[PDB]
């Protein structure tokens, strides 16, 4: 039986709780610089550096080596929105709203937001397209669940906006990412598993009102969609929801 | 002030009270209604736990406590020196948390995406509530609830189990302990494949999903997939709370002998109640 | 099954 | 009607068969009971 | 009224996935089992391939005897009586020898040598089973976090049933082998040793263990509220930020002040998940080898009146 | 009465099969468990008792 | 009558396993409660008519 | 009475034999089992009181 | 079929399955002849 | 008796040798100890008394 | 037919080296079990 | 034994020496292990009481 | 035959030699227990 | 014993060699815990009792 | 020819320099063991 204090009350346990506490303020440094590779340094609302980053330092460059040839990523490093974000401020001070220039859904802004990811598909680990059609899907079928091929699709004003001819599945996780609808104009949009609520006679949309899912975005290709693609797309539906409220 | 991607996501609206008045940022933070209110609410609680500090005597952090009223004081108040401080930082603590709840789902709303954080936190807020709230009003008294202090909330746990034998024997105990030992097992298991599917080897190329299928079907025979682990770790942080909150509610109220003895009506099963042998019998 | 969920046995089978 | 895809042919048939089944089983625990009956009875 | 993504509304069977063969047997590993429906509700469908190399039957055999060991030794409690094997399954129980025996392997097999040949067994299905996770990570290419995560809960564990007992210098220290028996020692470990409760170590492996539950909740919720902008896919957010990503570090940044990445956000996970094994293991090997009141040390340093 | 055969068609006959096998393996146990709980008819301990065993 | 309706909107096949574990449910605790009645338990009853106890 | 052969077109020939297997190897020992808890029937116990081994 | 097995296969796989059959329960009831005469149970 | 062969058709040989494996270990060792948990097949204690080793 | 892909001749070797094999596990369990009986009787 | 060499035609022979491997150590030590535990044949135990040890 | 595609020579090369490590382990084995035997017999 | 060298035919040295390392190791560290812990063969206390060191 | 793609050769000199380290740690072992039964025999 140990016990023997060195001094004062420090024993074994002292010593063990007190190394303790000196390594979890090392790894909570640690950590919290781990999680500084996105989105430093901090910028003004002007977009120019900030005078206050912080009391974490950012911490050394890592760079990552994209699995089909795709490249290589080094974190942190410089960062820049490629892309024409349409917002004006409300106020010339800080730590206030940026209010939309037009339509916020359209521009992409706020809830409607997407990012300039890269133009390409995602591919799984044999370089072939993750995300394909059911049709380009050899031997892929519905398993479970009401089948949504011709269901019609109902928005949020609740009308019928078109009908599912197709799902869009993910082959290697094998589960559904999106179903394509077809308009009343013939054209063909995506939308994303998430977002529709499979119903016993209709998949309804909460997000999108009837006359709003002529504005999701397309796909070049119609059998492959790409990060940017789906990107635009999962961030109109989302947006969507704040607002398509006026209609519903 | 912002992160390098930020400015695009900081558009008006999604409040669910007020619009203007109370819809912008504080450094980092959303300064909704909800709020104002959390940051009063946890104020008022703090200092009026630094105020008890002073009334009681002791300027040691551990030893800072907040009991409840005694048992003789009922369901009412009492003076801020001997339960009163307590029923007031506990309305606080609601206040706060409620609040906090709240903003969650403003902000939410502000960033389009789904109410599944605020609803969890529900989760919580209700244990919480069931400890100093629910069970304490069925018990008719605020002095079963459990005390504000860092070494005497631990006193208040083991003399409320203790009033039950070993509490290990409560199943629905049982059942949120293996809720939380699963959730505890299945947030290592995520965060290591996630990682090392994220941080290969040496100079090797960033594995994808299906690298992380592979592994676990080699090592356990199933894989339950990216949505799949999310759904599961959130599943099992709620049920295990969800169970937590029912073996309390079930205890002092349905509840008031030695928790083993409950276990009696397996072994007195009429078929079997009476072979001799073994351990009961 | 939440739609049959309104013991256990009867959603199950 | 449906559910399975089978006939009424089959199903007739898998009906058949199932209740000659049952009534061999039925045949065999009546024999059984009546020598337990036999050898001590219950009523 | 909306999709909260927590069951798959529609499923979808293809071939059969085989998996990446980076460095892999094909010959140890098996075919692909059945699919499960149920399972497709709440995760993938499908069961297996297994791999099942020199390690993995080793693990294989060697807890396969533990667990017989443990059930034979039950039969024999039950007096070969499946009606008492089914009325006292939870009531028997393997017990470690006698403290007179110490450290020592001289124990009769009704007064613990029975514990000792189950505890061999399962040492080996352990401690192969921790060399298998890092085999299997190893013929992937990937990292080793699940080997070092692991042997946060394998030091727990051998601190609990083997380094402890010889440190303290009986195997009656140890945990016997049975549902409500290892409870029952569990509450009288509490009990030697003066409230538990006050174990610095104890409540640290405590703070980890609610942590695990505050941030697993946390981090399920976060993916399921992105889940619509492709947020599960998180290898793919972390090697090309979308917009999942923002919105979920935005809301966290506006709701605590400070947020993660799609990547650190597992270190976070896989830390908050190793110290609670790593810090309880600490505690109890301090436990009756350096303090064995806990109560009267809490005193001693504070955290308790005097 | 002899259109019974029709049953089969909604229901799974191979999940029937299953579900009836184990619902009279376990009916059949049920009763043998009864018999031997009861002394006047646990014939292990009647024939103990007739051959005096014990 | 027209009870056949009643098909027309319950699955007949959860309706069929429902009923099956419901009335084997029931009749297992009637023959029970006749069991623990000392004088509805026909094996304790013919044991005392036979004298076989 | 000979026509039971269809059954072997419900259930895979495999999955019953397995079934089948396991039911019997457990039943085998249920009822050894049963037997070596009574004392009547204990075949080592028997023996042992036949030739005085205790 | 459910199988797909063919009329014959059936056949075959009775017939066999029944040969078995037959064997285990002449051996299992010249077992419990011998325990009854070793130490009937009636 | 010769005709059984066809198992081997049936079922995989590999799968079923190493469940057999596996049963008869399992088998051979829940035996041997049930033999030792008897005093009157205890040969090691049997040995014992019988030489005086304790 | 053929679910393990074998064919009758293949099949029919097996099945005799496996028999051989059970012959002999057989012949020593009754070996063993004579010395058994004849050190002691379980009867 | 001139056809038990058919074995390795259907298992691969690096798994049949592994899993030959683990047996023969697992079972060696258990056995090892029954043999301490019984005071009879505790050659460490032996071997003290006959040298006049502790 | 030929699950795991090897010729018949190979097996029987593969097989004598894992009968004579298979002879040489239970020849050592016999010679324990006959020292056990003679220094403690157990029957 | 002459025709051994095929096992390295079919077995990677490096696992080969680190299996024998690591189950050396093992073996060695268990059986001197098993003498350290019988008091015949406390080496420290035979020292102890031996020199009168207590 | 084998799975691990050796060659005969390489076998043989593998073979030879592992049984070279097996006898040098098994007259270690020997020397050892005889010096702990000459110290304080187990028999
Ligand atoms: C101890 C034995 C070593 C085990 C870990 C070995 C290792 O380095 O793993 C690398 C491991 C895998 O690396 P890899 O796959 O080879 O690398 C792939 C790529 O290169 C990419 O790899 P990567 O870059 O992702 O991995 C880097 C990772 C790897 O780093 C580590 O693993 C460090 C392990 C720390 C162990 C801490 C021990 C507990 C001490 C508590 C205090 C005692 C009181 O870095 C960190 O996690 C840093 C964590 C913070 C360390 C510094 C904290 C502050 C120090 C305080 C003083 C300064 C202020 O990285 C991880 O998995 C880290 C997460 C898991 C950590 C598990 C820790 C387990 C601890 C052992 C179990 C308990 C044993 C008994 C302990 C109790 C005794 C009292
Ligand atoms: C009356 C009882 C005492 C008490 C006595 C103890 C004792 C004793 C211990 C704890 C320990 C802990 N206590 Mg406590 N504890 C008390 C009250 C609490 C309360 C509460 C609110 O009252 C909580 C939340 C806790 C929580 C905890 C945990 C933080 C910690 C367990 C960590 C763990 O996950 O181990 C579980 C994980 C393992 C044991 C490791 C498992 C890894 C191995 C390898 C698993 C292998 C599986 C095996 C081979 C079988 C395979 C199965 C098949 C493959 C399927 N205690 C009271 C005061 N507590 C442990 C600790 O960490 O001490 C500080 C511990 O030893
Ligand atoms: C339901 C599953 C688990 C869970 C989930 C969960 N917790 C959450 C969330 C979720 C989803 C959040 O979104 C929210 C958050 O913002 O996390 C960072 C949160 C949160 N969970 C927290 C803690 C926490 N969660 C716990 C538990 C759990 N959280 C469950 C196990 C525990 C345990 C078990 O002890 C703790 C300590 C916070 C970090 C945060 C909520 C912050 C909050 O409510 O902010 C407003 C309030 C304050 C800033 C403080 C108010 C202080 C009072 C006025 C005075 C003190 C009163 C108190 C009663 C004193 C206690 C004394 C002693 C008992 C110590
Ligand atoms: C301790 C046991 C010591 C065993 C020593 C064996 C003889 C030395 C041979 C040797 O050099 O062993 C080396 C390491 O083995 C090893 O730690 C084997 C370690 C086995 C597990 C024991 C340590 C686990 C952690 C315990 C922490 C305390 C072999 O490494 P490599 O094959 O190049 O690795 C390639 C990859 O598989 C990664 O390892
Ligand atoms: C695994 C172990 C996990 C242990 C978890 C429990 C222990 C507490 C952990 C706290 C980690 C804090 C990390 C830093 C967060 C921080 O300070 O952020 C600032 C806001 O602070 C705050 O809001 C303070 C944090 C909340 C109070 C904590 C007490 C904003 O600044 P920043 O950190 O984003 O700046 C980075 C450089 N620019
Ligand atoms: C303590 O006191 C107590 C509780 C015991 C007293 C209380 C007693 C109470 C409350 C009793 C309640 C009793 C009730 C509610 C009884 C209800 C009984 C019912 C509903 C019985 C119905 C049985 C139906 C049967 C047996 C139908 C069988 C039909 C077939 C076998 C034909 C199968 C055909 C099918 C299933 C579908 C046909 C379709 C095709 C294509 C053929
Ligand atoms: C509690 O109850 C107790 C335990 C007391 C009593 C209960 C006892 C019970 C229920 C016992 C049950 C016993 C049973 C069912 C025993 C069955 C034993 C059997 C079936 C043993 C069969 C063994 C077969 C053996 C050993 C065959 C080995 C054959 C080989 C090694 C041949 C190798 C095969 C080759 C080469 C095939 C390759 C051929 C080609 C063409 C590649
Ligand atoms: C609780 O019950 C107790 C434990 C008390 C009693 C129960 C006992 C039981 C159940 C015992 C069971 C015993 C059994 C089943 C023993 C079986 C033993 C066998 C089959 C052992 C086989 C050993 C084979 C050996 C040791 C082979 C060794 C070979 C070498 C050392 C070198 C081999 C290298 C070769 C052949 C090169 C070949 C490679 C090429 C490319 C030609
Ligand atoms: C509780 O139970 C107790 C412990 C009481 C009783 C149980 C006892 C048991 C089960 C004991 C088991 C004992 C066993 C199985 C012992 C086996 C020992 C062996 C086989 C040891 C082998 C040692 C081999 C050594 C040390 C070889 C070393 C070789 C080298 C250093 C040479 C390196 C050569 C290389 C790397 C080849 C490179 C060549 C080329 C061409 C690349
Ligand atoms: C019908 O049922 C059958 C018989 C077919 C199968 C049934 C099996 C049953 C009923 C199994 C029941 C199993 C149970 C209840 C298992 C419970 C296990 C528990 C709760 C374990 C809890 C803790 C165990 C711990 C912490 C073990 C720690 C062990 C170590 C750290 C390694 C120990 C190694 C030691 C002591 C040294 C060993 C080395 C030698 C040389 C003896
Ligand atoms: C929180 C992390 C930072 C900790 C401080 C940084 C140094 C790390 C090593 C510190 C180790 C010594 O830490 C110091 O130990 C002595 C040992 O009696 C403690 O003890 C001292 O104060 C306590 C409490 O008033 C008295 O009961 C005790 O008699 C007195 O000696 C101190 O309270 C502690 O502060
Ligand atoms: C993996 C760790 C391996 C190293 C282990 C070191 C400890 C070795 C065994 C513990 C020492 C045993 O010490 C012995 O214990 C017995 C009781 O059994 C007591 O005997 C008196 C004494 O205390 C001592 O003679
Ligand atoms: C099943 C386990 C059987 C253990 C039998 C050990 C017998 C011990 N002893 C001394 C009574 O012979
Ligand atoms: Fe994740």
Same mark, same amino acid.
């Given at each position: 039986?140990?016990?023997?204090?060195?001094?004062?009350?420090? =024993?074994?346990?002292?010593?063990?709780?007190?190394?303790?506490?000196?390594?979890?303020?090392?790894?909570?440094?640690?950590?919290?610089?781990?999680?500084?590779?996105?989105?430093?340094?901090?910028?003004?609302?002007?977009?120019?550096?900030?005078?206050?980053?912080?009391?974490?330092?950012?911490?050394?460059?890592?760079?990552?080596?994209?699995?089909?040839?795709?490249?290589?990523?080094?974190?942190?490093?410089?960062?820049?929105?490629?892309?024409?974000?349409?917002?004006?401020?409300?106020?010339?001070?800080?730590?206030?709203?940026?209010?939309?220039?037009?339509?916020?859904?359209?521009?992409?802004?706020?809830?409607?937001?997407?990012?300039?990811?890269?133009?390409?598909?995602?591919?799984?680990?044999?370089?072939?397209?993750?995300?394909?059609?059911?049709?380009?899907?050899?031997?892929?079928?519905?398993?479970?669940?009401?089948?949504?091929?011709?269901?019609?699709?109902?928005?949020?004003?609740?009308?019928?906006?078109?009908?599912?001819?197709?799902?869009?599945?993910?082959?290697?996780?094998?589960?559904?990412?999106?179903?394509?609808?077809?308009?009343?104009?013939?054209?063909?949009?995506?939308?994303?598993?998430?977002?529709?609520?499979?119903?016993?006679?209709?998949?309804?949309?909460?997000?999108?009102?009837? =006359?709003?899912?002529?504005?999701?975005?397309?796909?070049?290709?119609?059998?492959?969609?790409?990060?940017?693609?789906?990107?635009?797309?999962?961030?109109?539906?989302?947006?969507?929801?704040?607002?398509?409220?006026?209609?519903? | 002030?912002?992160?390098?991607?930020?400015?695009?996501?900081?558009?008006?609206?999604?409040?669910?009270?007020?619009?203007?008045?109370?819809?912008?940022?504080?450094?980092?933070?959303?300064?909704?209604?909800?709020?104002?209110?959390?940051?009063?609410?946890?104020?008022?609680?703090?200092?009026?736990?630094?105020?008890?500090?002073?009334?009681?005597?002791?300027?040691?952090? @551990?030893?800072?406590?907040?009991?409840?009223?005694?048992?003789?004081?009922?369901?009412?108040?009492?003076?801020?020196?001997?339960?009163?401080?307590? @029923?007031?930082?506990?309305?606080?603590?609601?206040?706060?948390?409620?609040?906090?709840?709240?903003?969650?789902?403003?902000?939410?709303?502000?960033?389009?995406?789904?109410?599944?954080?605020?609803?969890?936190?529900?989760?919580?807020?209700?244990?919480?509530?069931?400890?100093?709230?629910?069970?304490?009003?069925?018990?008719?008294?605020?002095?079963?609830?459990?005390?504000?202090?860092?070494?005497?909330?631990?006193?208040?746990?083991?003399?409320?189990?203790?009033?039950?034998?070993?509490?290990?024997?409560?199943?629905?105990?049982?059942?949120?302990?293996?809720?939380?030992?699963?959730?505890?097992?299945?947030?290592?298991?995520?965060?290591?494949?996630?990682?090392?599917?994220?941080?290969?080897?040496?100079?090797?190329?960033?594995?994808?999903?299906?690298?992380?299928?592979?592994?676990?079907?080699?090592?356990?025979?199933?894989?339950?997939?990216?949505?799949?682990?999310?759904?599961?770790?959130?599943?099992?942080?709620?049920?295990?709370?969800?169970?937590?909150?029912?073996?309390?509610?079930?205890?002092?109220?349905?509840?008031?002998?030695?928790?083993?003895?409950?276990?009696?009506?397996?072994?007195?099963?009429?078929?079997?109640?009476?072979?001799?042998?073994?351990?009961?019998? | 099954?939440?739609?049959?969920?309104?013991?256990?046995?009867?959603?199950?089978? | 009607?449906?559910?399975?895809?089978?006939?009424?042919?089959?199903?007739?048939?898998?009906?058949?068969?199932?209740?000659?089944?049952?009534?061999?089983?039925?045949?065999?625990?009546?024999?059984?009971?009546?020598?337990?009956?036999?050898?001590?009875?219950?009523? | 009224?909306?999709?909260?993504?927590?069951?798959?509304?529609?499923?979808?069977?293809?071939?059969?996935?085989?998996?990446?063969?980076?460095?892999?047997?094909?010959?140890?590993?098996?075919?692909?089992?059945?699919?499960?429906?149920?399972?497709?509700?709440?995760?993938?469908?499908?069961?297996?391939?297994?791999?099942?190399?020199?390690?993995?039957?080793?693990?294989?055999?060697?807890?396969?005897?533990?667990?017989?060991?443990?059930?034979?030794?039950?039969?024999?409690?039950?007096?070969?009586?499946?009606?008492?094997?089914?009325?006292?399954?939870?009531?028997?129980?393997?017990?470690?020898?006698?403290?007179?025996?110490?450290?020592?392997?001289?124990?009769?097999?009704?007064?613990?040598?029975?514990?000792?040949?189950?505890?061999?067994?399962?040492?080996?299905?352990?401690?192969?089973?921790?060399?298998?996770?890092?085999?299997?990570?190893?013929?992937?290419?990937?990292?080793?976090?699940?080997?070092?995560?692991?042997?946060?809960?394998?030091?727990?564990?051998?601190?609990?049933?083997?380094?402890?007992?010889?440190?303290?210098?009986?195997?009656?220290?140890?945990?016997?082998?049975?549902?409500?028996?290892?409870?029952?020692?569990?509450?009288?470990?509490?009990?030697?040793?003066?409230?538990?409760?006050?174990?610095?170590?104890?409540?640290?492996?405590?703070?980890?263990?609610?942590?695990?539950?505050?941030?697993?909740?946390?981090?399920?919720?976060?993916?399921?509220?992105?889940?619509?902008?492709?947020?599960?896919?998180?290898?793919?957010?972390?090697?090309?930020?979308?917009?999942?990503?923002?919105?979920?570090?935005?809301?966290?940044?506006?709701?605590?002040?400070?947020?993660?990445?799609?990547?650190?956000?597992?270190?976070?996970?896989?830390?908050?998940?190793?110290?609670?094994?790593?810090?309880?293991?600490?505690?109890?090997?301090?436990?009756?080898?350096?303090?064995?009141?806990?109560?009267?040390?809490?005193?001693?340093?504070?955290?308790?009146?005097? | 009465?002899?259109?019974?055969?029709?049953?089969?068609?909604?229901?799974?006959?191979?999940?029937?099969?299953?579900?009836?096998?184990?619902?009279?393996?376990?009916?059949?146990?049920?009763?043998?468990?009864?018999?031997?709980?009861?002394?006047?008819?646990?014939?292990?301990?009647?024939?103990?008792?007739?051959?005096?065993?014990?």
């Amino acid at each position: 039986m140990v016990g023997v204090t060195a001094f004062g009350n420090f =024993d074994l346990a002292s010593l063990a709780i007190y190394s303790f506490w000196i390594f979890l303020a090392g790894l909570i440094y640690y950590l919290q610089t781990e999680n500084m590779r996105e989105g430093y340094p901090l910028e003004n609302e002007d977009g120019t550096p900030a005078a206050n980053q912080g009391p974490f330092p950012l911490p050394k460059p890592k760079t990552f080596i994209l699995p089909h040839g795709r490249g290589t990523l080094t974190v942190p490093g410089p960062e820049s929105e490629d892309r024409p974000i349409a917002l004006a401020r409300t106020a010339v001070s800080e730590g206030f709203p940026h209010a939309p220039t037009g339509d916020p859904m359209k521009d992409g802004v706020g809830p409607a937001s997407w990012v300039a990811r890269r133009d390409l598909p995602e591919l799984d680990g044999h370089g072939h397209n993750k995300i394909k059609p059911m049709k380009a899907a050899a031997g892929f079928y519905v398993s479970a669940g009401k089948n949504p091929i011709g269901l019609p699709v109902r928005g949020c004003d609740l009308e019928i906006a078109g009908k599912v001819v197709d799902i869009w599945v993910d082959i290697p996780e094998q589960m559904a990412r999106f179903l394509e609808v077809e308009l009343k104009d013939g054209s063909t949009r995506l939308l994303p598993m998430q977002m529709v609520k499979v119903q016993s006679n209709r998949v309804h949309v909460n997000a999108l009102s009837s =006359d709003l899912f002529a504005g999701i975005p397309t796909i070049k290709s119609p059998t492959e969609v790409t990060l940017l693609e789906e990107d635009k797309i999962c961030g109109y539906v989302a947006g969507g929801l704040m607002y398509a409220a006026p209609k519903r | 002030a912002l992160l390098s991607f930020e400015r695009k996501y900081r558009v008006p609206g999604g409040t669910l009270v007020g619009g203007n008045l109370f819809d912008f940022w504080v450094g980092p933070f959303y300064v909704g209604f909800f709020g104002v209110a959390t940051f009063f609410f946890a104020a008022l609680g703090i200092i009026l736990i630094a105020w008890s500090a002073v009334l009681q005597g002791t300027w040691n952090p @551990q030893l800072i406590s907040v009991y409840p009223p005694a048992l003789e004081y009922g369901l009412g108040g009492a003076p801020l020196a001997k339960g009163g401080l307590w @029923q007031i930082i506990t309305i606080c603590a609601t206040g706060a948390f409620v609040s906090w709840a709240l903003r969650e789902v403003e902000i939410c709303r502000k960033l389009g995406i789904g109410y599944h954080i605020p609803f969890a936190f529900a989760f919580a807020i209700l244990a919480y509530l069931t400890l100093v709230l629910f069970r304490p009003v069925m018990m008719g008294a605020w002095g079963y609830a459990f005390p504000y202090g860092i070494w005497t909330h631990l006193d208040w746990v083991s003399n409320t189990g203790y009033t039950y034998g070993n509490f290990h024997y409560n199943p629905a105990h049982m059942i949120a302990i293996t809720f939380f030992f699963t959730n505890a097992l299945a947030l290592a298991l995520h965060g290591a494949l996630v990682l090392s599917a994220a941080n290969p080897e040496k100079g090797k190329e960033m594995r994808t999903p299906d690298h992380e299928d592979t592994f676990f079907r080699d090592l356990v025979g199933y894989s339950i997939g990216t949505l799949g682990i999310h759904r599961l770790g959130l599943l099992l942080s709620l049920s295990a709370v969800f169970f937590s909150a029912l073996c309390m509610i079930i205890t002092g109220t349905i509840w008031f002998d030695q928790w083993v003895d409950w276990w009696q009506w397996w072994v007195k099963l009429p078929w079997w109640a009476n072979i001799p042998g073994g351990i009961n019998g | 099954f939440a739609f049959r969920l309104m013991a256990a046995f009867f959603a199950a089978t | 009607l449906g559910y399975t895809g089978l006939t009424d042919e089959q199903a007739q048939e898998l009906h058949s068969v199932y209740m000659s089944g049952l009534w061999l089983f039925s045949a065999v625990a009546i024999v059984a009971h009546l020598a337990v009956y036999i050898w001590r009875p219950w009523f | 009224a909306e999709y909260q993504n927590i069951f798959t509304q529609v499923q979808v069977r293809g071939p059969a996935d085989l998996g990446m063969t980076e460095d892999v047997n094909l010959a140890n590993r098996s075919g692909v089992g059945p699919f499960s429906t149920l399972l497709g509700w709440f995760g993938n469908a499908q069961l297996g391939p297994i791999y099942l190399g020199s390690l993995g039957v080793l693990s294989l055999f060697s807890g396969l005897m533990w667990f017989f060991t443990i059930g034979i030794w039950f039969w024999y409690q039950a007096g070969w009586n499946p009606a008492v094997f089914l009325r006292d399954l939870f009531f028997f129980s393997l017990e470690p020898p006698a403290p007179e025996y110490g450290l020592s392997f001289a124990a009769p097999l009704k007064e613990g040598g029975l514990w000792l040949i189950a505890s061999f067994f399962m040492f080996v299905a352990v401690w192969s089973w921790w060399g298998r996770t890092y085999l299997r990570a190893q013929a992937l290419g990937m990292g080793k976090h699940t080997a070092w995560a692991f042997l946060s809960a394998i030091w727990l564990w051998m601190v609990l049933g083997f380094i402890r007992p010889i440190l303290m210098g009986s195997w009656s220290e140890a945990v016997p082998y049975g549902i409500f028996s290892h409870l029952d020692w569990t509450n009288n470990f509490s009990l030697v040793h003066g409230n538990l409760f006050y174990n610095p170590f104890h409540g640290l492996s405590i703070a980890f263990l609610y942590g695990s539950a505050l941030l697993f909740a946390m981090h399920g919720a976060t993916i399921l509220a992105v889940s619509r902008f492709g947020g599960e896919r998180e290898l793919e957010q972390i090697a090309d930020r979308g917009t999942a990503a923002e919105r979920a570090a935005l809301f966290w940044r506006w709701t605590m002040g400070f947020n993660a990445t799609m990547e650190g956000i597992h270190r976070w996970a896989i830390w908050m998940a190793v110290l609670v094994t790593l810090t309880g293991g600490i505690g109890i090997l301090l436990s009756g080898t350096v303090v064995d009141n806990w109560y009267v040390w809490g005193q001693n340093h504070g955290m308790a009146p005097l | 009465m002899s259109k019974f055969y029709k049953i089969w068609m909604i229901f799974d006959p191979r999940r029937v099969f299953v579900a009836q096998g184990v619902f009279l393996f376990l009916l059949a146990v049920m009763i043998h468990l009864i018999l031997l709980s009861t002394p006047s008819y646990n014939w292990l301990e009647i024939s103990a008792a007739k051959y005096n065993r014990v």
